[PDB]
Amino acid sequence: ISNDIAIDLGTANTLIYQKGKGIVLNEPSVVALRNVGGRKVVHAVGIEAKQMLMEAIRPMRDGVIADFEVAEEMIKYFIRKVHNRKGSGNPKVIVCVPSGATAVERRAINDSCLNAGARRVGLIDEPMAAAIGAGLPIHEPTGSMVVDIGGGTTEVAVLSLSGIVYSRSVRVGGDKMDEAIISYMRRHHNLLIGETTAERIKKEIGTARAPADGEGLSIDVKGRDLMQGVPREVRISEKQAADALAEPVGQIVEAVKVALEATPPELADDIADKGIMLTGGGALLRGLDAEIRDHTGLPVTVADDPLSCVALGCGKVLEHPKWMKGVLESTLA
Ligand SMILES: Nc1ncnc2c1ncn2[C@@H]1O[C@H](COP(=O)(O)OP(=O)(O)O)[C@@H](O)[C@H]1O
Ligand SMILES: [Mg+2]
């Protein structure tokens, strides 16, 4: 029985695919730090940390390693958590990393896996894993565009010839959408709300396009009054949430358009045929596909299972390592 794993080390969520088992771990990429005698201690990791949240730290939140020690501890914790005692002790590991990850960041990730016992580590770039999981024909000379909207980043890439031809990331994704909602409630309604409430609003009435409709549906939002601090409830409409999200949505649209203008022709025309493939959790924002379509004049398809696409692509590379080439940049023990 195998301990080989592929890790989607996301800005917001970490997923681990295990050989012969599938996705065995899907947890937020968060650590709870405790202050003990002026020292900071990694007290809890993942869903256990989120459930007890001490200071919250998301060490990968912006698509770069913010805290190396904490990121390493988080990686080791997750690897240890999925380890099977009755399985091999020296597994092969794949980790998905952002395209712009630096040598130092990549070395840190490789070392984390080697220090947890891996006999070999291969790194794969996020948009390649996303394309593979979305089922894009990244072997053909046909141009493909994938737009992966995650937590702290959106990555856009043009693929062909088993390779990335263009890639660019911007620090706008689902986190900035939540922050926009938090900011809207504070400035427009004098109401302090937390990330959990912001995410519920985004999922329930959040949308990339205002209702022609008028104001659309509405929900009740519970928070604390800004000046007072007393619990207060405020009704918010789909129109209002659309207003709140307009700015980060606009920045995601701009990222796609910037990528398009930088797309080396020939490839331009291969794109307007089958369009753009959206993946990542951020792609689940209602109407974002239509909004991108309307402002690029390009067709837009949302990948099946956009939250899991990267993990499933990594898993496919893990299971069928002969299927493709040098998608992996590898390091042995
Ligand atoms: N139904 C939904 N509507 C809008 N956003 C969503 C939905 N479900 C999840 N998300 C968002 O997806 C983002 C996480 O996407 P993910 O691809 O896991 O990011 P990363 O790979 O960077 O960790 C979060 O900001 C989360 O709020
Ligand atoms: Mg991701």
Residue numbers in the entry: 9 to 61, 68 to 347
Authors' text:
The MreB fibres are attached to the cell membrane via a hydrophobic loop in Thermotoga maritima as well as Gram+ bacteria and via an additional N-terminal amphipathic helix in Gram− bacteria. Here, we demonstrate that MreB from Caulobacter crescentus forms pairs of antiparallel protofilaments as revealed by crystal structures, an architecture unprecedented among actin-like proteins. The crystal structure of Caulobacter MreB (ΔCcMreBdh) reveals the typical actin fold, containing two domains on either side of a nucleotide binding cleft (Kabsch and Holmes, 1995).
A single mutation in the intra-protofilament interface (S283D, ΔCcMreBdmh) renders the protein monomeric, as shown both by crystallography and by EM. This mutant turned out to be most useful in studying the polymerisation cycle. Monomeric CcMreB shows little structural movement between the ADP- and the ATP analogue AMPPNP-bound states with domains I and II overlapping with an RMSD of 1.58 and 0.57 Å, respectively. (D) Superposition of ADP-bound ΔCcMreBdmh (m_2, shown in orange) and AMPPNP-bound ΔCcMreBdmh (m_3, shown in blue). A small movement of domain IB initiates the propeller twist observed upon polymerisation.
